[PDB]
Paper text:
The heterohexameric ATPases associated with diverse cellular activities (AAA)-ATPase Pex1/Pex6 is essential for the formation and maintenance of peroxisomes. Pex1/Pex6, similar to other AAA-ATPases, uses the energy from ATP hydrolysis to mechanically thread substrate proteins through its central pore, thereby unfolding them. Pex1 and Pex6 belong to a family of type 2 ATPases associated with diverse cellular activities (AAA)-ATPases that form hexameric complexes consisting of two stacked ATPase rings, D1 and D2, topped by N-terminal domains. Unlike these better-studied homohexameric AAA-ATPases, Pex1 and Pex6 form a heterohexameric ATPase with alternating Pex1 and Pex6 subunits.
Recombinant Pex1/Pex6 was incubated with ATP and an in vitro substrate mEOS-Pex15 1-309 and a 3D reconstruction was determined to ∼4 Å for the D1 domains and ∼5 to 9 Å for the D2 domains. We docked and rebuilt AlphaFold models of Pex1 and Pex6 into the cryo-EM map, starting with the Pex1 and Pex6 subunits at the highest overall resolution (Pex6–chain B and Pex1–chain C), and then fitting these models into the density of the other subunits. Although our biochemical assays suggest that Pex1/Pex6 unfolds the Pex15 1-309 domain of the mEOS-Pex15 1-309 fusion before stalling on the mEOS moiety, we did not observe density attributable to substrate in the central pore of this structure in 2D class averages or the final 3D reconstruction. Indeed, we find density for nucleotide in all the D1 ATPase domains, which we modeled as ATP. While the D1 ATPase domains do not have conserved hydrophobic pore loops, the helices that would position these loops in the central pore are on the same plane, making the D1 ATPase ring planar and symmetrical. In contrast to the well-resolved D1 ATPase ring, the resolution of the D2 ATPase domains is lower and varies by subunit position. This is consistent with a vertical “spiral staircase” configuration common to many AAA-ATPases. In this spiral staircase, subunit Pex1-A is in the highest position, Pex1-E is in the lowest position, and Pex6-F is the “seam” subunit at an intermediate position. The density and positions of Pex1-A, Pex6-B, Pex1-C, and Pex6-D are consistent with these subunits being nucleotide bound, and we have therefore modeled them with ATP in the binding pocket. Both Pex1-E and Pex6-F are at a lower resolution than the other domains and farther from the adjacent subunit and therefore were not modeled with nucleotide bound.
Author numbering:
A (entry chain F): 1 to 1030
B (entry chain E): 924 to 1026
C (entry chain A): 463 to 923
D (entry chain B): 509 to 613
The structure:
């Protein structure tokens, strides 16, 4: 609720004075330990999250008057701060107490107060030195107690809550990195370092576009209701005192002749804008496109002195939006509304920005409403989405006044006439972020240093633009292509266009096509594009002609197709190229860019005719990091949070990790993950809100939410892709894993987890080959590696490759390898390589086909390790004695890991507990007895069969018991209920529940026989020994 | 040589990265969690302030092979050709030398 | 089809309007199909999105989306699957652009709701463009629901009433695999054929119910030639004791102790193969144990899938598997599987190989697809792929052995003493207490088919 | 429907056929109830076009099918005590979706 506010410098944890009217609402509560949350106006969209504070009553405070410590925030109220705030006293809920919190103390404080051996005395000293009371004080994260010497870092479970000296978790940490030294409150920097006091007329200062709109309720002093709202600029109070002018005054900004007026106010502390700077809306900046530093001088012109104009000629600024016939009506209506709002201030040659919600374009709404103020309150029912530009071409005055150059426009007295269109370059993104100021869908800001392709493409436009200005014409064209969709190549095109402040001419191929089959398609398309261009291009250069999904039109066609279609395609393409050439010629400086999903599909002729050809690849690790930063940015998160509460995530998120797991995705996937995290956050927040009734302030997103969102997105992507072999496996399902844990982890994940260390041009571990009794878990262990480490998996059985004579065997391994290269990261498995990798050189087969296969696999396995990081080869053998020795060499296989018969009872114990982890076992089961019972010759598959047979036996017992129940109850009740009916409704839970006894396992074990003969065990051990020896 | 060097450049300071910043002290009435969860994060949850990359550090030192390394590699690396293959192909090369192989 | 989605959406629209104040724009896709021209439509979607925005929040809905926006069925014949874009695909892209632009512009206001009959049928573009967050499939109704469906259906005709002895629970038991439309049609049938005989005061009867069901042909089974009526029972086949026990342990045991297997937490054994001597009864014991279980039976022979086109055969396999899965608990059977999915490397065009991987996708595909009881027979199992016989991956296989003295006597006694379907007495004029023992002696090495043929020609003599 | 169609290809075909049947039936039916609407070789219009055919014709056939179904439903709703009978020489051809929607066989 709206309550007056003032700042006292009594300390961060000093009590907050509350006016008695505020105190009354607490009422039944203690009335002495009153706690209230606050929200402070934020200079831009969104609201500062409410901070909870301990308050005390004070009648001296006037009606609805409160006092809060400014030092609590990083500033003291030297200059005036916000007059008001939004206060809320929580009545039903009480202040939560944070069990754990994080702090920071300077080195000297650590080494001095730590001297005491007792923590209670130290915390008592902390209370004395900081006025913090247990069960009385509330602590927030990122709170500063000493000016660069005391810090609060983190709080748990919540980021703020009541303090309990004894029971609370408190972290005693120091500042050994000298970070606290630089920590200082805003406005605390200057110990009144007296700036030069003078009556200087002009003071050259730097200019900055307003990051976001400023609400009028923050104008101290408040201005008049009817004052025009489009001519305001702001800065620190010190600048005004240097100009010895007051907030709400008129001051003239001039640079090399071009001058304008502006209404100037002060920025209420706390700050957040660069000091010694002048902030102006785009209105001012546009007139100063090339001026960052500009001169500012006082003004003595009074409001009454401003002349009133009668007729003003305005030439609409040339622009892509301006040429849309679909919008002319709505743009004109919003234009007329903009003047009808109130008296306008303008000068000759001035520019006018107008914003409108294009979605409301075709719906001409309530124009017959004569001079109705209600139009204001459709505005929030509207939301302006896109902007257009206007040029002050001429103003007509009827009397010579003091302020002849400037002038005022009144709808009841001033007439306006639209005129021809005038060209004007759009402001570069550097001078202002129009989307951000107007709160549109801000386009992701690249860091050119991390997006080399974007840098390369940009390195084209400005050079062309300069050479054109330098009198050098050159038809600079470029075509974007990619191997996968959903990469935002159009987004990067828009980003580049705004970066250079160049007009954009976007034409979706998949929007205006008509019938591209009849003998009109070529003509209709060419005419439509030509019309959409000629109407804007003459007054819009420099700009770019962008064709989205250009390939859709230019479809290369095979001969056997209908010849007429071939001819029509040849036309469409040739005249398309001719139109491009004519466009380039007629208007020098224009450049053409096209977006294509597949570079190859474009006809070769035009492609050659194209100048620059660039592919946009999938985002990389650091690129994913930047994308996550962008989306998770509060500005990106709160674009459309109409609900008052803001959204945000805890600082404890390891963005680097989320990037890591973000491999093999696209920007839309990342946006989907972020919005899914938004889902989970809002859902859980509303759940808690109904549960407890207290709002944990804003909404938060936890790393688990994003992890699960990426999991689900990857599941959908996988269903889209071929790889079906990553469903679900973990270590709990398989034992016998600890024996080679170190080797497997070092071989697999270390190169992935430390590539820069492996970027030494070193042979990355080629692969792993496993051998031993079948069913021991070799394939299961490989699947565990794949699923835990999340690499695309395909299983290939060597024997399946062999054909009658040689249909296709080498080509097949080549296809699997290349498709693996597409689906990086990935893991490839060969089942029974011995059946495809036998010892060669001694025997002579019939045809010798296999020799080339083994040579090819050797050569490929050696050729991938050099650079092909992310793809790894693993083979499976059960009779390695047949395996060719050439593979045993490092480079083909270096870690000949083994998975043998379970010798010790621990192996069988782990295997059985992993197998029956999800069995509904009676307590009688004592698996040690079974492990001793099982001869060591039993393998993992033997244990799987054992568990399955024990389930079968137990289900048989339960079935016999159920049949006995059925018969008994049948005789008792006199009817004949079918088993199905008995199970649908008569069956209670115990009927549907399965109970397992040790007797079932004993029966299964007695029924099971060695899957491997002891002679086979000795053969396997001998083969092991012989291979391990060398 | 690189296997030898794995104890020459990796031995530097602590395991690759930054360490030896330890934990200072605690005040809990039972909550004695000193693990990295509240150690790596919190104080320095970011590895460094706005962490990024820098000049060559991971592979600063090349594992320059030594005369002993080459000596032992020679003996470890067995001949890739059996004498039977050598003599057979040489004899066949002479047989075609009677006609073409040579002059 | 037939799950009454349309009414689901109408009831929805009603509830959402009454409870949460969302402007809703219902529009069936049939009308748009009426004039599915790109520009004309583009205009309509503009109008829609504009109006829907005009009332924030809004909700679009389109029953039968596939009708208009449904991408032509994947292949559709043209090798140029890429490069060129189907008109409806362009329309979907247009709609996507508008709605997603508004969404980023305003998540709250507009929330579309599509309605289709299959994920693949619906154009995948929306999926690839991440337009759809999550989807729900309307499964066939359950018996417990069918109770209330019928209790409201014949309520609609308030005149008719059930019988005291009969109960809605019955209706649920016999009814199955019937969508609400199917239950509607069945109740209309029962009302009409009840009005046939005007003796009772429109009271249900067991006999009219049975006659109606017998005459009934539900949509799911409609349009399919289910070769099920064979009437081969235990009495028709008595030998192969081990095969009988294994088949009971596989088929009858689940249907007879479902409660126990419900929590049996390994995935149940999918199905078993049959092999043995030609004509040795592999086609017979399967049907006999199917009747034992009373489960749904389908006999699929090698040819049914095989076709002329390449790629179309795979989709024929696809909807074959769709039908098979739709009828849990059902038995699917493939005869002459040696002519269906042999070992790879036995085809120049490789259509056999791709077909085989297609088949493997389903069984190896862990999608809760286990109610269908897969089955197959072949006299030449050697010709099948080993992967199709991997233990654990696939279940046991059943051998058929030579009928020796014991088995020969068993089969001879069974067939000679067979009670007729038309008459009930012996199928043959059976010697009351002749010496059937000596007959088996001279039939060493025969086959049950040979034994029955011997008896048949003896009956002719 | 085997005789008077007078049009089977043109995209207007579906509209022409449906409009003609609707025109005649609503022209005569209102004053003639009770009555029966009979379609001879009804299948010759309704069928399940194979995927082995150009798409737009499949769309046209799906349309004509849907409007036939809507026509029968509208006629029965608007004219109580009215029924129809259809004749077909093979069940397999008629749209299964349509068949399910009907009552008697
Ligand atoms: N870093 C980014 N790169 C690309 N797109 C991004 C990025 N961040 C956000 N996006 C969003 O992803 C979408 C990119 O779509 P866009 O049409 O530009 O893709 P494209 O690569 O041309 O793909 P296609 O033509 O196959 O759909 C936009 O909605 C854009 O706002
Ligand atoms: N709540 C309900 N849900 C589903 N069906 C219902 C419901 N109540 C009644 N039914 C019956 O289900 C059938 C609904 O048919 P409907 O035409 O709506 O099918 P649909 O599955 O929506 O598909 P389509 O419109 O494409 O044919 C009718 O026979 C109706 O009597
Ligand atoms: N026990 C039996 N064993 C074999 N055939 C029997 C037996 N009892 C009856 N028959 C009759 O013998 C014939 C069995 O041939 P059937 O084709 O059904 O067998 P199959 O083993 O499935 O062979 P195939 O796969 O070659 O068709 C049928 O005519 C059946 O009526």
């Amino acid at each position: 609720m709206k309550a007056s506010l003032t700042f006292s410098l009594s300390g961060i944890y000093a009590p907050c004075s509350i006016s008695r009217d505020i105190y009354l609402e607490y009422g039944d509560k203690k009335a002495e330990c009153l706690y209230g949350t606050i929200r402070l106006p934020q200079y831009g969209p969104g609201c500062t999250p409410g901070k909870i504070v301990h308050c005390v009553l004070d009648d001296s405070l006037p009606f609805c008057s409160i006092v809060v410590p400014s030092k609590l925030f990083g500033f003291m109220p030297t200059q005036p701060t916000m007059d008001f705030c939004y206060f809320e006293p929580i009545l039903d809920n009480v202040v939560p107490v944070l069990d754990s919190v994080t702090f920071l103390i300077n080195e000297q404080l650590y080494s001095k107060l730590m001297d005491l051996p007792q923590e209670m005395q130290q915390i008592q000293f902390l209370h004395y030195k900081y006025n913090i009371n247990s069960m009385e004080t509330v602590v927030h994260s990122r709170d500063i107690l000493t000016s660069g010497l005391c810090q609060i870092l983190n709080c748990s479970p919540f980021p703020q809550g009541l303090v309990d000296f004894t029971e609370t978790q408190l972290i005693l940490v120091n500042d050994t990195e000298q970070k606290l030294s630089a920590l200082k409150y805003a406005n605390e920097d200057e110990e009144y370092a007296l700036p030069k006091i003078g009556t200087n007329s002009a003071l050259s200062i730097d200019l900055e576009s307003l990051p976001c709109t400023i609400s009028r309720d923050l104008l101290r002093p408040a201005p008049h209701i009817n004052d025009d709202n489009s001519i305001y600029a702001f800065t620190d109070a010190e600048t005004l005192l240097r100009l010895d002018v007051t907030s709400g005054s008129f001051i003239t900004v001039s640079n090399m002749g071009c001058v304008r007026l502006v209404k100037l106010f002060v920025l209420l502390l706390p700050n957040g804008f660069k000091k010694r700077t002048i902030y102006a809306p785009p209105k001012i900046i546009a007139s100063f496109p090339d001026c960052s530093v500009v001169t500012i001088s006082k003004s003595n012109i009074g409001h009454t002195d401003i002349p009133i104009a009668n007729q003003v000629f305005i030439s609409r600024v040339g622009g892509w939006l301006q040429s849309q016939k679909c919008f002319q009506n709505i743009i004109l209506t919003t234009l007329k509304k903009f003047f009808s709002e109130s008296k306008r201030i303008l000068c000759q040659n001035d520019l006018i920005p107008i914003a409108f919600d294009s979605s409301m374009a075709d719906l001409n709404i309530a124009e017959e409403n004569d001079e109705s103020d209600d139009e204001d309150e459709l505005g929030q029912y509207y939301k302006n989405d896109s902007l257009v530009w206007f040029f002050v071409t001429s103003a007509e005055l009827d009397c010579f006044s003091k302020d002849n150059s400037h002038f005022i426009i009144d709808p009841n007295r001033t007439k306006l006439i639209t005129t021809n269109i005038t060209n004007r370059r759009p402001l570069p993104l550097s001078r202002s972020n129009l989307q951000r100021y107007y709160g549109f869908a801000e386009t992701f800001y690249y860091d050119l240093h991390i997006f080399p392709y974007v840098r390369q493409l940009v390195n084209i436009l400005e050079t062309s633009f300069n050479c054109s200005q330098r009198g050098i014409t050159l038809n600079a064209s470029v075509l974007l292509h990619s191997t996968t969709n959903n990469v935002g190549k159009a987004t990067m095109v828009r980003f580049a266009s705004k970066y250079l402040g160049i007009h954009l001419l976007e034409i979706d191929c998949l929007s205006l096509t008509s019938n591209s089959r009849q003998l009109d398609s070529t003509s209709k398309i060419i005419g439509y594009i030509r019309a959409k261009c000629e109407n804007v291009l003459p007054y819009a250069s420099p700009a770019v002609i962008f064709l989205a999904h250009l390939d859709s039109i230019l479809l290369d066609v095979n001969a056997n197709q209908d010849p007429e279609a071939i001819k029509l395609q040849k036309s469409i393409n040739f005249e398309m190229s001719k139109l491009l050439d004519d466009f380039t010629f007629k208007f020098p400086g224009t450049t053409f860019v096209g977006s294509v999903n597949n570079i190859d599909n474009v006809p070769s002729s035009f492609r050659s005719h194209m100048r620059f050809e660039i592919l946009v690849p999938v985002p990389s690790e650091a690129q994913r990091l930047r994308i996550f930063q962008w989306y998770l940015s509060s500005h990106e998160l709160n674009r459309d949070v109409q609900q008052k509460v803001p959204v945000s995530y805890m600082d404890n998120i390891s963005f680097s990790s989320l990037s890591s797991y973000s491999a093999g995705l696209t920007p839309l996937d990342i946006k989907s993950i972020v919005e899914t995290a938004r889902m989970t956050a809002t859902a859980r927040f509303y759940q808690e809100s109904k549960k407890c009734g207290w709002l944990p302030q804003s909404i938060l997103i936890t790393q688990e939410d994003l992890s699960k969102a990426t999991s689900k997105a990857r599941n959908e992507f996988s269903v889209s892709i071929g790889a079906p072999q990553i469903p679900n496996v973990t270590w709990d399902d398989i034992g016998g894993i600890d024996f080679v844990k170190g080797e497997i982890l070092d071989t697999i994940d270390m190169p992935l987890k430390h590539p820069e260390l492996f970027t030494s041009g070193m042979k990355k571990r080629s692969g792993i080959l496993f051998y031993g009794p079948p069913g021991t878990g070799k394939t299961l262990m490989a699947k565990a590696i794949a699923t835990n480490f999340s690499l695309n998996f395909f299983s290939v059985k060597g024997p399946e490759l062999l054909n009658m004579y040689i249909g296709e065997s080498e080509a097949n391994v080549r296809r699997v390898f290349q498709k693996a290269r597409e689906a990086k990261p990935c893991v490839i498995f060969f089942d029974e390589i011995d059946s495809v990798a036998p010892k060669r050189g001694n025997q002579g087969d019939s045809g010798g086909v296999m020799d080339r296969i083994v040579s090819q696999l050797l050569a490929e396995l050696d050729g991938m390790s050099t650079d092909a990081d992310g793809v790894f080869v693993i083979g499976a053998t059960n009779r390695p004695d047949l395996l060719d020795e050439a593979l045993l060499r490092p480079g083909r296989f270096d870690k000949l890991l083994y998975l043998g018969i379970p010798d010790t009872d621990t192996k069988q114990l782990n295997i059985l507990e992993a197998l029956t982890r999800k069995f509904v076992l009676d307590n009688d089961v004592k698996l040690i007895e079974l492990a001793k019972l099982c001869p060591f010759n039993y393998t993992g598959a033997d244990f799987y069969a054992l568990c399955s047979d024990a389930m079968l036996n137990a289900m048989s017992r339960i079935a016999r018991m159920v049949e006995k129940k059925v018969s008994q109850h049948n005789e008792l009740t006199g009817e004949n209920i079918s088993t199905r009916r008995w199970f649908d409704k008569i069956a209670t839970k115990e009927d549907t529940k399965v109970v397992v006894k040790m007797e079932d396992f004993l029966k299964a074990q007695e029924q099971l026989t060695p899957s491997v003969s002891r002679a086979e065990l000795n053969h396997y051990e001998a083969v092991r020994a012989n291979f391990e020896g060398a | 040589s690189v296997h030898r060097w794995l104890s020459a450049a990796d031995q530097s300071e602590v395991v690759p990265g930054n360490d030896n910043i330890e934990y200072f002290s605690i005040n809990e009435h039972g909550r004695r969690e000193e693990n990295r969860l509240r150690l790596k994060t919190l104080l320095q949850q970011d590895v460094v302030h706005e962490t990024k990359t820098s000049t060559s550090a991971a592979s600063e030192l090349t594992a320059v092979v030594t005369i002993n390394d080459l000596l032992e590699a020679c003996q470890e690396t067995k001949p890739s050709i059996s004498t039977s293959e050598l003599v057979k192909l040489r004899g066949i090369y002479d047989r075609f030398q009677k006609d073409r192989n040579g002059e | 089809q037939g799950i009454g989605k349309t009414r689901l959406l109408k009831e929805l629209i009603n509830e959402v309007e009454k409870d949460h104040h969302i402007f809703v724009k219902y529009a069936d896709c049939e009308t748009l199909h009426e004039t599915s021209n790109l520009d004309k439509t583009q205009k309509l979607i503009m109008e829609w999105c504009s109006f829907c925005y005009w009332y924030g929040p809004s909700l679009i809905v389109l029953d039968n989306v596939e009708a208009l926006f449904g991408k032509p069925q994947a292949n559709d014949g043209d090798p140029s699957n890429n490069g060129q874009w189907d008109n409806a695909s362009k329309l979907l892209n247009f709609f996507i652009n508008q709605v997603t632009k508004i969404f980023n512009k305003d998540n709250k206001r507009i929330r579309v709701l599509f309605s289709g009959k299959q994920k693949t049928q619906i154009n995948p573009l929306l999926f690839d463009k991440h337009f759809v967050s999550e989807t729900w499939s309307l499964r066939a109704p359950d018996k417990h629901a069918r109770a209330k469906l019928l209790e409201y259906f014949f309520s609609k005709n308030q005149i008719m009433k059930l019988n005291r002895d009969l109960q809605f629970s019955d209706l649920s038991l016999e009814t199955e695999g019937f969508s609400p439309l199917d239950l509607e049609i069945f109740t209309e049938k029962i009302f009409y054929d009840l009005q046939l005989e005007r003796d009772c005061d429109n009271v249900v009867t067991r006999e009219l119910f049975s006659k109606s069901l017998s005459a009934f042909t539900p949509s799911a089974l409609r349009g399919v030639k289910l070769t099920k009526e064979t009437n081969i029972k235990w009495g028709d086949i008595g030998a192969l004791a081990n095969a009988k026990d294994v088949l009971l342990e596989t088929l009858e045991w689940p249907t007879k102790y479902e409660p126990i297997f419900v929590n049996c937490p390994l995935r149940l054994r999918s199905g078993i193969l049959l092999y043995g001597y030609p004509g040795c009864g592999k086609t017979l014991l399967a049907s006999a144990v199917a009747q034992q279980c009373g489960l749904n039976f389908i006999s699929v022979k090698g040819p049914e899938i095989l076709n002329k086109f390449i790629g179309a055969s795979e989709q024929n396999i696809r909807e074959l598997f769709e039908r098979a899965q739709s009828v849990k608990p059902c038995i699917l059977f493939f005869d002459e599987f040696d002519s269906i999915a042999p070992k790879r490397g036995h085809d120049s065009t490789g259509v056999t190989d791709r077909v085989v991987n297609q088949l493997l996708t389903q069984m190896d595909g862990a999608e809760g697809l286990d109610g269908v009881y897969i089955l197959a027979a072949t006299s030449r199992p050697d010709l099948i792929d080993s992967a199709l016989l991997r233990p654990g991956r696939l279940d046991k296989s059943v051998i058929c052995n030579i009928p020796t003295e014991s088995e020969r006597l068993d089969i001879l006694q069974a067939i000679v003493n067979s009670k007729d379907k038309d008459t009930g007495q012996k199928k043959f004029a059976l010697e009351k207490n002749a010496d059937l023992k000596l007959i088996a002696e001279k039939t060493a090495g025969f086959s049950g088919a040979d034994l029955q043929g011997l008896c048949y020609n003896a009956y002719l003599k």
